[PDB]
Amino acid sequence: DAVKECSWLIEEIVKPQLPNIIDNFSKCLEMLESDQIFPTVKGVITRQGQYIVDFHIVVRFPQFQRGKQVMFRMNTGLNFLLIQFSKIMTHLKNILEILNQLQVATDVSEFVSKFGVAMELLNHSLILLQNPPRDLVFPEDNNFAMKEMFQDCYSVCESTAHILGLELTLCRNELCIELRNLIKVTKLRRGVTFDNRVVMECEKLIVSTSDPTLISISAKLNSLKASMANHQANLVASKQLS
Template identity: 40%
Template sequence: MTTELYPNDLFGGPDQYDFVKDLAAERFWLVNEIVKPELPNILDNVEKCLEMLHSDQVFKMPISSGVNGGTNGPSVKGIVTRQGQYLLDFKAIVKFPEFHKGKQVLLRMNTGTKFLLSQIQSIENNLGYILELLEELQIIDDAQKFIEKLGKVLELLISSINLLESPPRRLSFPDNNNFAMKQMFQDYNNLCENPHYEIALEILLYKNELCIDFRNVHKVSKKPWCQIDSKTGKSLTDDIKDQLTTDRSKSLANVLKSEGIQIEEPTLIKNLMSSFNTESTTLSQAQNYLNRCVTFNGKVVMECEKIAMTTSDPSLISITSKLSALENSVSTFYTNLKI
Protein backbone atom coordinates (compact mmCIF):
# COMPACT_ATOMS: atom_id res chain seq x y z
CA MET A 1 0.00 0.00 0.00
CA THR A 2 1.30 3.46 -0.85
CA THR A 3 0.44 6.85 0.58
CA GLU A 4 0.72 10.20 -1.12
CA LEU A 5 1.15 13.33 0.99
CA TYR A 6 -0.33 16.64 0.02
CA PRO A 7 1.41 19.24 2.18
CA ASN A 8 -0.46 22.12 0.56
CA ASP A 9 -3.84 20.45 0.48
CA LEU A 10 -6.54 22.99 1.33
CA PHE A 11 -9.75 21.42 2.53
CA GLY A 12 -12.61 22.80 0.53
CA GLY A 13 -10.32 24.33 -2.10
CA PRO A 14 -8.02 27.36 -2.09
CA ASP A 15 -10.85 29.74 -2.90
CA GLN A 16 -12.50 28.86 0.41
CA TYR A 17 -9.31 29.01 2.48
CA ASP A 18 -8.50 32.12 4.58
CA PHE A 19 -4.82 32.25 5.59
CA VAL A 20 -5.36 35.16 7.99
CA LYS A 21 -8.15 33.43 9.86
CA ASP A 22 -6.19 30.19 9.95
CA LEU A 23 -3.15 31.95 11.45
CA ALA A 24 -5.34 33.71 14.00
CA ALA A 25 -7.00 30.43 14.95
CA GLU A 26 -3.62 28.74 15.33
CA ARG A 27 -2.32 31.52 17.57
CA PHE A 28 -5.50 31.44 19.62
CA TRP A 29 -5.02 27.71 20.13
CA LEU A 30 -1.33 28.13 21.07
CA VAL A 31 -2.13 30.87 23.57
CA ASN A 32 -5.00 29.08 25.29
CA GLU A 33 -3.90 25.46 25.08
CA ILE A 34 -0.11 25.67 25.31
CA VAL A 35 1.07 28.95 26.84
CA LYS A 36 -1.63 29.93 29.33
CA PRO A 37 -1.56 26.59 31.18
CA GLU A 38 2.15 27.22 31.84
CA LEU A 39 1.70 30.76 33.18
CA PRO A 40 1.01 29.68 36.80
CA ASN A 41 4.27 27.73 36.82
CA ILE A 42 6.19 30.69 35.38
CA LEU A 43 4.56 33.02 37.88
CA ASP A 44 5.44 30.68 40.73
CA ASN A 45 9.12 30.64 39.76
CA VAL A 46 9.23 34.43 39.48
CA GLU A 47 7.71 34.68 42.97
CA LYS A 48 10.34 32.28 44.30
CA CYS A 49 13.10 34.47 42.84
CA LEU A 50 11.59 37.52 44.52
CA GLU A 51 11.26 35.67 47.82
CA MET A 52 14.96 34.84 47.76
CA LEU A 53 15.88 38.42 46.91
CA HIS A 54 13.61 39.78 49.66
CA SER A 55 14.77 37.23 52.20
CA ASP A 56 15.85 38.51 55.62
CA GLN A 57 18.51 35.83 55.75
CA VAL A 58 21.97 37.22 56.42
CA PHE A 59 24.89 35.87 54.39
CA LYS A 60 28.40 36.31 55.76
CA MET A 61 31.00 35.71 53.09
CA PRO A 62 34.76 35.67 53.65
CA ILE A 63 37.03 37.47 51.20
CA SER A 64 40.70 36.72 50.82
CA SER A 65 43.45 37.27 48.29
CA GLY A 66 44.87 33.91 49.28
CA VAL A 67 48.20 35.46 50.25
CA ASN A 68 49.54 35.36 53.78
CA GLY A 69 50.17 38.70 55.44
CA GLY A 70 53.85 37.90 55.88
CA THR A 71 54.60 38.06 52.15
CA ASN A 72 55.76 41.15 50.31
CA GLY A 73 52.91 41.09 47.79
CA PRO A 74 49.51 42.79 47.98
CA SER A 75 46.97 41.08 50.22
CA VAL A 76 43.40 41.38 51.45
CA LYS A 77 41.54 39.49 54.13
CA GLY A 78 38.10 40.24 55.48
CA ILE A 79 34.40 39.46 55.60
CA VAL A 80 31.33 40.83 53.83
CA THR A 81 27.75 40.61 55.10
CA ARG A 82 24.77 40.78 52.73
CA GLN A 83 21.05 40.88 53.42
CA GLY A 84 18.69 41.30 50.49
CA GLN A 85 19.87 44.07 48.21
CA TYR A 86 22.26 45.57 50.77
CA LEU A 87 25.72 44.99 52.14
CA LEU A 88 25.31 45.46 55.89
CA ASP A 89 28.94 45.10 56.87
CA PHE A 90 32.34 45.14 55.24
CA LYS A 91 35.57 44.57 57.13
CA ALA A 92 38.93 44.11 55.46
CA ILE A 93 42.65 44.44 56.06
CA VAL A 94 44.32 45.64 52.86
CA LYS A 95 48.01 45.85 52.07
CA PHE A 96 49.78 47.11 48.97
CA PRO A 97 53.60 47.25 49.00
CA GLU A 98 53.68 50.64 47.25
CA PHE A 99 50.97 52.24 49.41
CA HIS A 100 52.33 53.72 52.65
CA LYS A 101 55.36 51.44 52.26
CA GLY A 102 53.28 48.32 52.69
CA LYS A 103 51.51 49.41 55.86
CA GLN A 104 48.24 47.56 56.47
CA VAL A 105 45.01 49.53 56.01
CA LEU A 106 42.05 48.55 58.19
CA LEU A 107 38.70 49.18 56.53
CA ARG A 108 35.57 48.97 58.66
CA MET A 109 32.19 49.95 57.26
CA ASN A 110 30.46 52.88 58.94
CA THR A 111 28.06 51.79 61.69
CA GLY A 112 24.46 51.83 60.49
CA THR A 113 25.44 52.23 56.84
CA LYS A 114 23.88 50.07 54.14
CA PHE A 115 25.52 49.77 50.74
CA LEU A 116 22.97 49.22 47.98
CA LEU A 117 23.72 46.53 45.41
CA SER A 118 21.92 48.28 42.56
CA GLN A 119 21.96 45.20 40.32
CA ILE A 120 19.77 43.32 42.80
CA GLN A 121 17.50 46.34 43.15
CA SER A 122 17.02 46.52 39.37
CA ILE A 123 16.33 42.78 39.13
CA GLU A 124 13.75 43.06 41.91
CA ASN A 125 12.02 45.89 40.04
CA ASN A 126 12.03 43.86 36.82
CA LEU A 127 10.59 40.77 38.50
CA GLY A 128 7.90 42.83 40.22
CA TYR A 129 6.81 44.19 36.85
CA ILE A 130 6.93 40.69 35.35
CA LEU A 131 4.49 39.47 38.02
CA GLU A 132 2.03 42.20 37.05
CA LEU A 133 2.33 41.28 33.37
CA LEU A 134 1.86 37.57 34.06
CA GLU A 135 -1.33 38.25 36.00
CA GLU A 136 -2.62 40.34 33.10
CA LEU A 137 -1.68 37.63 30.59
CA GLN A 138 -3.88 35.09 32.36
CA ILE A 139 -7.03 37.06 31.53
CA ILE A 140 -6.14 38.50 28.10
CA ASP A 141 -8.13 37.00 25.22
CA ASP A 142 -6.70 39.08 22.38
CA ALA A 143 -3.82 37.07 20.90
CA GLN A 144 -1.91 40.09 19.59
CA LYS A 145 -2.01 41.88 22.95
CA PHE A 146 -1.00 38.62 24.61
CA ILE A 147 2.05 38.32 22.36
CA GLU A 148 3.07 41.94 22.99
CA LYS A 149 2.93 41.57 26.77
CA LEU A 150 4.71 38.22 26.63
CA GLY A 151 7.43 39.95 24.62
CA LYS A 152 7.76 42.51 27.40
CA VAL A 153 8.14 39.70 29.94
CA LEU A 154 10.92 38.22 27.82
CA GLU A 155 12.60 41.62 27.51
CA LEU A 156 12.60 42.08 31.29
CA LEU A 157 13.99 38.59 31.88
CA ILE A 158 16.81 39.19 29.39
CA SER A 159 17.53 42.56 31.02
CA SER A 160 17.73 40.90 34.45
CA ILE A 161 20.13 38.24 33.20
CA ASN A 162 22.28 40.85 31.44
CA LEU A 163 22.58 42.82 34.68
CA LEU A 164 24.48 39.85 36.11
CA GLU A 165 26.29 38.64 33.00
CA SER A 166 27.30 42.10 31.76
CA PRO A 167 27.35 44.44 34.78
CA PRO A 168 26.80 48.14 34.01
CA ARG A 169 30.01 50.05 33.30
CA ARG A 170 29.15 52.63 35.95
CA LEU A 171 29.84 49.96 38.59
CA SER A 172 33.28 49.07 37.24
CA PHE A 173 36.66 50.74 37.53
CA PRO A 174 37.35 53.45 36.45
CA ASP A 175 33.77 54.59 35.77
CA ASN A 176 32.64 54.02 39.37
CA ASN A 177 34.90 56.84 40.64
CA ASN A 178 35.45 54.95 43.90
CA PHE A 179 31.75 55.18 44.75
CA ALA A 180 31.78 52.14 47.05
CA MET A 181 34.74 53.45 49.04
CA LYS A 182 33.06 56.85 49.49
CA GLN A 183 29.74 55.32 50.55
CA MET A 184 31.01 52.77 53.04
CA PHE A 185 33.98 54.36 54.78
CA GLN A 186 33.66 57.75 56.42
CA ASP A 187 37.35 58.60 56.57
CA TYR A 188 38.32 56.96 53.29
CA ASN A 189 40.40 59.95 52.11
CA ASN A 190 42.82 59.65 55.01
CA LEU A 191 42.77 55.87 54.96
CA CYS A 192 43.11 55.17 51.27
CA GLU A 193 44.72 58.16 49.65
CA ASN A 194 48.01 60.01 49.77
CA PRO A 195 49.67 62.52 47.41
CA HIS A 196 50.92 59.78 45.09
CA TYR A 197 48.54 56.82 45.39
CA GLU A 198 44.90 55.93 45.97
CA ILE A 199 43.25 52.62 46.82
CA ALA A 200 40.23 51.96 44.61
CA LEU A 201 37.39 49.59 45.49
CA GLU A 202 35.05 47.91 43.02
CA ILE A 203 32.02 45.89 44.15
CA LEU A 204 29.62 44.23 41.74
CA LEU A 205 27.73 41.04 41.04
CA TYR A 206 28.86 38.84 38.17
CA LYS A 207 26.69 35.83 37.38
CA ASN A 208 26.27 34.12 40.77
CA GLU A 209 29.23 35.68 42.54
CA LEU A 210 29.99 38.81 44.50
CA CYS A 211 33.14 40.30 42.98
CA ILE A 212 35.38 42.61 44.98
CA ASP A 213 38.47 44.23 43.47
CA PHE A 214 41.02 46.41 45.22
CA ARG A 215 43.46 48.47 43.16
CA ASN A 216 46.39 50.63 44.09
CA VAL A 217 46.52 53.40 41.49
CA HIS A 218 49.30 55.91 40.92
CA LYS A 219 48.31 59.54 40.37
CA VAL A 220 49.83 60.92 37.18
CA SER A 221 51.53 64.28 37.75
CA LYS A 222 53.33 64.86 34.44
CA LYS A 223 51.77 67.56 32.27
CA PRO A 224 49.86 67.59 30.01
CA TRP A 225 48.85 63.98 30.75
CA CYS A 226 47.50 64.81 34.20
CA GLN A 227 45.25 67.61 33.01
CA ILE A 228 41.47 67.19 32.85
CA ASP A 229 39.06 69.39 30.93
CA SER A 230 36.72 70.92 33.50
CA LYS A 231 33.89 71.15 30.96
CA THR A 232 33.98 67.59 29.60
CA GLY A 233 35.60 65.78 32.52
CA LYS A 234 37.92 64.10 30.03
CA SER A 235 41.69 63.87 30.22
CA LEU A 236 44.16 64.33 27.38
CA THR A 237 44.48 60.56 27.01
CA ASP A 238 40.68 60.30 26.69
CA ASP A 239 40.67 62.91 23.92
CA ILE A 240 43.54 61.29 22.04
CA LYS A 241 41.93 57.85 22.26
CA ASP A 242 38.66 59.32 20.98
CA GLN A 243 40.42 60.95 18.02
CA LEU A 244 42.31 57.78 17.10
CA THR A 245 39.15 55.70 17.38
CA THR A 246 36.97 58.12 15.42
CA ASP A 247 39.44 58.65 12.58
CA ARG A 248 41.58 55.58 11.90
CA SER A 249 43.60 57.47 9.30
CA LYS A 250 45.15 59.69 11.98
CA SER A 251 48.53 58.73 13.38
CA LEU A 252 49.50 59.15 17.01
CA ALA A 253 52.28 61.56 16.03
CA ASN A 254 49.85 63.83 14.17
CA VAL A 255 47.36 63.83 17.04
CA LEU A 256 50.09 64.67 19.56
CA LYS A 257 51.29 67.56 17.40
CA SER A 258 47.73 68.89 17.06
CA GLU A 259 47.53 68.89 20.87
CA GLY A 260 50.71 70.96 21.07
CA ILE A 261 52.92 68.17 22.40
CA GLN A 262 56.51 68.14 21.20
CA ILE A 263 57.74 64.74 20.03
CA GLU A 264 61.34 63.85 20.87
CA GLU A 265 63.50 61.14 19.34
CA PRO A 266 63.97 58.13 21.66
CA THR A 267 67.59 58.65 22.75
CA LEU A 268 68.80 58.20 26.32
CA ILE A 269 69.57 61.88 26.89
CA LYS A 270 66.34 63.06 25.32
CA ASN A 271 64.36 60.49 27.30
CA LEU A 272 65.81 61.99 30.46
CA MET A 273 65.11 65.51 29.25
CA SER A 274 61.52 64.70 28.27
CA SER A 275 60.86 63.44 31.78
CA PHE A 276 61.52 66.99 32.99
CA ASN A 277 60.04 68.82 30.01
CA THR A 278 56.32 68.71 30.68
CA GLU A 279 55.29 69.46 27.11
CA SER A 280 57.53 66.97 25.28
CA THR A 281 57.49 63.21 24.97
CA THR A 282 58.70 60.33 22.87
CA LEU A 283 56.20 58.24 20.94
CA SER A 284 56.89 55.23 23.16
CA GLN A 285 56.24 57.31 26.29
CA ALA A 286 53.03 58.66 24.79
CA GLN A 287 51.91 55.15 23.91
CA ASN A 288 52.62 54.05 27.47
CA TYR A 289 50.42 56.83 28.84
CA LEU A 290 47.64 55.95 26.40
CA ASN A 291 47.82 52.27 27.32
CA ARG A 292 47.91 52.72 31.08
CA CYS A 293 46.20 56.00 31.96
CA VAL A 294 42.52 56.20 32.89
CA THR A 295 40.40 59.02 34.24
CA PHE A 296 39.27 58.07 37.72
CA ASN A 297 37.66 60.04 40.53
CA GLY A 298 38.53 63.39 38.96
CA LYS A 299 42.16 62.59 38.24
CA VAL A 300 44.38 60.69 35.82
CA VAL A 301 45.80 57.48 37.26
CA MET A 302 47.74 54.35 36.34
CA GLU A 303 46.96 50.99 37.89
CA CYS A 304 49.96 49.66 39.84
CA GLU A 305 48.60 46.68 41.74
CA LYS A 306 45.32 44.81 41.79
CA ILE A 307 43.66 42.17 43.93
CA ALA A 308 40.57 40.49 42.44
CA MET A 309 38.37 38.32 44.65
CA THR A 310 35.10 36.48 44.18
CA THR A 311 32.83 34.82 46.69
CA SER A 312 29.87 32.64 45.78
CA ASP A 313 26.51 33.94 46.96
CA PRO A 314 24.18 31.01 47.81
CA SER A 315 20.92 32.69 46.81
CA LEU A 316 22.35 34.12 43.59
CA ILE A 317 23.30 30.63 42.43
CA SER A 318 19.65 29.58 42.61
CA ILE A 319 18.30 32.86 41.21
CA THR A 320 20.55 32.88 38.15
CA SER A 321 19.58 29.29 37.40
CA LYS A 322 15.85 30.09 37.65
CA LEU A 323 16.17 33.24 35.53
CA SER A 324 17.92 31.31 32.75
CA ALA A 325 15.25 28.60 32.80
CA LEU A 326 12.47 31.21 32.74
CA GLU A 327 14.08 33.08 29.85
CA ASN A 328 14.43 29.86 27.86
CA SER A 329 10.80 28.89 28.44
CA VAL A 330 9.29 32.31 27.68
CA SER A 331 11.56 32.74 24.66
CA THR A 332 10.31 29.45 23.19
CA PHE A 333 6.66 30.45 23.65
CA TYR A 334 7.24 33.92 22.24
CA THR A 335 9.13 32.65 19.19
CA ASN A 336 6.39 30.15 18.34
CA LEU A 337 3.70 32.81 18.65
CA LYS A 338 5.60 35.31 16.50
CA ILE A 339 6.11 32.91 13.58
Protein backbone atom coordinates (compact mmCIF):
# COMPACT_ATOMS: atom_id res chain seq x y z
CA ASP A 1 0.00 0.00 0.00
CA ALA A 2 2.12 2.87 1.35
CA VAL A 3 5.43 2.93 3.22
CA LYS A 4 4.45 6.21 4.88
CA GLU A 5 4.30 4.43 8.24
CA CYS A 6 7.78 3.05 7.59
CA SER A 7 9.10 6.51 6.73
CA TRP A 8 7.55 8.09 9.83
CA LEU A 9 8.68 5.27 12.14
CA ILE A 10 12.20 6.74 12.11
CA GLU A 11 11.07 9.28 14.71
CA GLU A 12 9.95 6.50 17.07
CA ILE A 13 12.95 4.26 16.26
CA VAL A 14 15.82 6.36 14.92
CA LYS A 15 15.18 9.48 17.00
CA PRO A 16 15.48 7.83 20.45
CA GLN A 17 18.79 6.35 19.25
CA LEU A 18 19.87 9.61 17.58
CA PRO A 19 21.35 11.33 20.68
CA ASN A 20 23.17 8.16 21.77
CA ILE A 21 25.12 8.34 18.49
CA ILE A 22 25.43 12.12 18.12
CA ASP A 23 26.86 12.56 21.61
CA ASN A 24 29.29 9.67 21.14
CA PHE A 25 30.52 11.07 17.82
CA SER A 26 30.93 14.53 19.34
CA LYS A 27 32.88 13.09 22.27
CA CYS A 28 35.15 11.18 19.88
CA LEU A 29 35.69 14.29 17.74
CA GLU A 30 36.46 16.58 20.70
CA MET A 31 39.64 14.66 21.50
CA LEU A 32 41.02 14.91 17.95
CA GLU A 33 40.32 18.66 17.60
CA SER A 34 41.80 19.76 20.95
CA ASP A 35 45.22 19.79 22.56
CA GLN A 36 45.74 16.80 24.83
CA ILE A 37 48.45 15.01 26.79
CA PHE A 38 50.61 12.91 24.46
CA PRO A 39 69.62 -0.87 16.32
CA THR A 40 66.51 1.13 17.23
CA VAL A 41 65.31 4.73 17.16
CA LYS A 42 65.40 6.97 20.24
CA GLY A 43 63.15 9.69 21.62
CA VAL A 44 59.41 10.27 21.46
CA ILE A 45 57.06 12.68 19.68
CA THR A 46 53.64 14.09 20.50
CA ARG A 47 50.60 15.03 18.42
CA GLN A 48 48.66 18.08 19.61
CA GLY A 49 45.02 17.47 18.79
CA GLN A 50 44.79 17.33 15.00
CA TYR A 51 48.20 18.69 13.94
CA ILE A 52 51.45 17.43 15.47
CA VAL A 53 53.97 20.24 16.00
CA ASP A 54 56.41 18.45 18.34
CA PHE A 55 58.90 15.77 17.30
CA HIS A 56 61.84 14.34 19.25
CA ILE A 57 62.39 10.90 17.67
CA VAL A 58 65.57 9.76 15.92
CA VAL A 59 66.56 7.14 13.33
CA ARG A 60 68.89 4.13 13.47
CA PHE A 61 68.95 2.94 9.86
CA PRO A 62 72.17 0.96 9.21
CA GLN A 63 72.35 2.34 5.66
CA PHE A 64 71.32 5.86 6.71
CA GLN A 65 73.82 8.69 7.19
CA ARG A 66 76.61 6.54 5.72
CA GLY A 67 76.34 4.12 8.65
CA LYS A 68 75.77 6.74 11.35
CA GLN A 69 72.50 6.91 13.26
CA VAL A 70 70.32 9.71 11.90
CA MET A 71 69.47 11.63 15.08
CA PHE A 72 67.38 14.24 13.25
CA ARG A 73 66.30 15.92 16.47
CA MET A 74 63.80 18.72 15.93
CA ASN A 75 65.22 22.25 16.12
CA THR A 76 63.33 22.89 19.37
CA GLY A 77 60.08 21.96 17.59
CA LEU A 78 58.18 23.60 14.76
CA ASN A 79 54.58 24.01 13.66
CA PHE A 80 53.02 21.39 11.40
CA LEU A 81 49.61 20.47 9.99
CA LEU A 82 48.13 16.96 9.98
CA ILE A 83 45.29 16.04 7.61
CA GLN A 84 44.61 12.57 9.07
CA PHE A 85 42.78 14.08 12.05
CA SER A 86 41.58 17.17 10.17
CA LYS A 87 39.33 15.11 7.89
CA ILE A 88 37.98 13.20 10.90
CA MET A 89 37.21 16.47 12.71
CA THR A 90 35.48 17.89 9.63
CA HIS A 91 33.39 14.73 9.22
CA LEU A 92 32.46 14.79 12.92
CA LYS A 93 31.43 18.45 12.72
CA ASN A 94 29.32 17.74 9.62
CA ILE A 95 27.70 14.77 11.37
CA LEU A 96 26.91 16.89 14.43
CA GLU A 97 25.39 19.61 12.24
CA ILE A 98 23.30 17.00 10.41
CA LEU A 99 22.08 15.49 13.68
CA ASN A 100 21.20 18.98 14.93
CA GLN A 101 19.36 20.18 11.81
CA LEU A 102 17.89 17.21 9.91
CA GLN A 103 16.89 15.41 13.13
CA VAL A 104 13.65 17.41 12.94
CA ALA A 105 13.57 17.21 9.15
CA THR A 106 10.09 17.04 7.65
CA ASP A 107 11.27 14.58 4.97
CA VAL A 108 13.08 11.47 6.20
CA SER A 109 15.10 11.43 2.97
CA GLU A 110 17.28 14.33 4.14
CA PHE A 111 17.90 12.68 7.52
CA VAL A 112 18.75 9.38 5.82
CA SER A 113 21.17 11.15 3.47
CA LYS A 114 22.85 12.94 6.37
CA PHE A 115 23.16 9.69 8.32
CA GLY A 116 24.62 7.92 5.29
CA VAL A 117 27.14 10.71 4.74
CA ALA A 118 28.16 10.58 8.40
CA MET A 119 28.54 6.79 8.31
CA GLU A 120 30.62 6.99 5.13
CA LEU A 121 32.84 9.62 6.76
CA LEU A 122 33.27 7.42 9.83
CA ASN A 123 34.20 4.45 7.63
CA HIS A 124 36.69 6.63 5.75
CA SER A 125 38.22 7.72 9.06
CA LEU A 126 38.51 4.09 10.18
CA ILE A 127 40.17 3.15 6.88
CA LEU A 128 42.60 6.07 7.15
CA LEU A 129 43.40 4.87 10.67
CA GLN A 130 44.04 1.34 9.35
CA ASN A 131 46.74 2.47 6.91
CA PRO A 132 48.85 5.63 6.65
CA PRO A 133 47.53 8.46 4.47
CA ARG A 134 48.70 8.64 0.87
CA ASP A 135 51.10 11.54 1.51
CA LEU A 136 52.28 10.12 4.86
CA VAL A 137 53.48 6.73 3.56
CA PHE A 138 57.24 6.46 3.06
CA PRO A 139 57.02 5.55 -0.66
CA GLU A 140 54.97 8.72 -1.32
CA ASP A 141 56.15 10.79 1.66
CA ASN A 142 59.03 12.62 -0.07
CA ASN A 143 60.81 12.85 3.29
CA PHE A 144 58.10 15.12 4.72
CA ALA A 145 58.66 16.31 8.30
CA MET A 146 62.21 14.88 8.11
CA LYS A 147 63.98 17.06 5.51
CA GLU A 148 63.17 20.56 6.83
CA MET A 149 61.12 20.14 10.01
CA PHE A 150 63.95 18.34 11.81
CA GLN A 151 67.10 20.33 12.52
CA ASP A 152 70.01 19.57 10.18
CA CYS A 153 67.67 17.32 8.20
CA TYR A 154 69.41 18.17 4.92
CA SER A 155 72.33 15.91 5.87
CA VAL A 156 70.46 13.96 8.56
CA CYS A 157 68.02 12.70 5.90
CA GLU A 158 69.89 13.33 2.62
CA SER A 159 73.44 12.17 3.37
CA THR A 160 75.80 11.89 0.42
CA ALA A 161 76.42 8.17 0.94
CA HIS A 162 72.70 7.45 1.38
CA ILE A 163 69.38 9.18 2.01
CA LEU A 164 67.56 8.82 5.34
CA GLY A 165 64.05 10.06 4.59
CA LEU A 166 61.65 9.56 7.49
CA GLU A 167 58.00 8.55 7.21
CA LEU A 168 54.93 8.36 9.43
CA THR A 169 53.72 4.80 10.10
CA LEU A 170 50.06 5.52 10.85
CA CYS A 171 49.04 1.95 10.00
CA ARG A 172 48.34 0.77 13.57
CA ASN A 173 45.39 3.09 14.33
CA GLU A 174 47.93 5.38 16.00
CA LEU A 175 50.60 7.94 15.18
CA CYS A 176 54.15 6.68 14.63
CA ILE A 177 57.30 7.90 12.90
CA GLU A 178 59.96 5.76 11.21
CA LEU A 179 62.49 5.98 8.40
CA ARG A 180 64.03 3.98 5.56
CA ASN A 181 67.65 4.44 4.45
CA LEU A 182 68.58 4.03 0.79
CA ILE A 183 71.91 4.40 -0.99
CA LYS A 184 72.34 7.18 -3.53
CA VAL A 185 70.85 6.22 -6.91
CA THR A 186 69.50 7.70 -10.16
CA LYS A 187 72.70 9.65 -10.88
CA LEU A 188 62.89 1.65 -11.37
CA ARG A 189 62.98 -0.67 -8.36
CA ARG A 190 65.25 1.64 -6.34
CA GLY A 191 63.29 4.76 -7.28
CA VAL A 192 62.85 7.51 -9.84
CA THR A 193 62.96 10.92 -8.13
CA PHE A 194 62.71 10.28 -4.38
CA ASP A 195 63.31 13.70 -2.80
CA ASN A 196 64.92 14.76 -6.11
CA ARG A 197 67.41 11.86 -5.84
CA VAL A 198 66.03 8.32 -6.03
CA VAL A 199 67.79 6.08 -3.50
CA MET A 200 67.76 2.28 -3.55
CA GLU A 201 66.42 0.95 -0.25
CA CYS A 202 69.17 -0.67 1.81
CA GLU A 203 67.90 -0.57 5.41
CA LYS A 204 64.87 0.32 7.50
CA LEU A 205 64.12 1.46 11.05
CA ILE A 206 60.40 0.68 11.30
CA VAL A 207 59.07 1.42 14.79
CA SER A 208 55.48 0.94 15.93
CA THR A 209 53.87 3.03 18.67
CA SER A 210 50.36 3.28 20.11
CA ASP A 211 48.14 6.34 20.48
CA PRO A 212 46.85 6.64 24.08
CA THR A 213 44.11 9.06 22.99
CA LEU A 214 43.64 8.11 19.33
CA ILE A 215 42.99 4.44 20.13
CA SER A 216 39.90 5.22 22.22
CA ILE A 217 38.60 7.68 19.61
CA SER A 218 39.11 5.08 16.88
CA ALA A 219 37.28 2.44 18.93
CA LYS A 220 34.35 4.78 19.59
CA LEU A 221 34.22 5.72 15.90
CA ASN A 222 34.25 2.05 14.91
CA SER A 223 31.38 1.23 17.26
CA LEU A 224 29.42 4.26 16.05
CA LYS A 225 29.98 3.23 12.43
CA ALA A 226 28.83 -0.31 13.20
CA SER A 227 25.61 1.02 14.72
CA MET A 228 25.14 3.51 11.88
CA ALA A 229 25.45 0.68 9.35
CA ASN A 230 22.35 -1.04 10.72
CA HIS A 231 20.61 2.31 11.15
CA GLN A 232 21.25 3.23 7.50
CA ALA A 233 20.17 -0.21 6.26
CA ASN A 234 16.90 0.07 8.18
CA LEU A 235 16.33 3.62 6.94
CA VAL A 236 17.00 2.71 3.30
CA ALA A 237 14.75 -0.35 3.53
CA SER A 238 11.63 1.78 3.95
CA LYS A 239 12.63 4.04 1.05
CA GLN A 240 13.24 1.00 -1.17
CA LEU A 241 9.86 -0.47 -0.19
CA SER A 242 7.83 2.52 -1.43
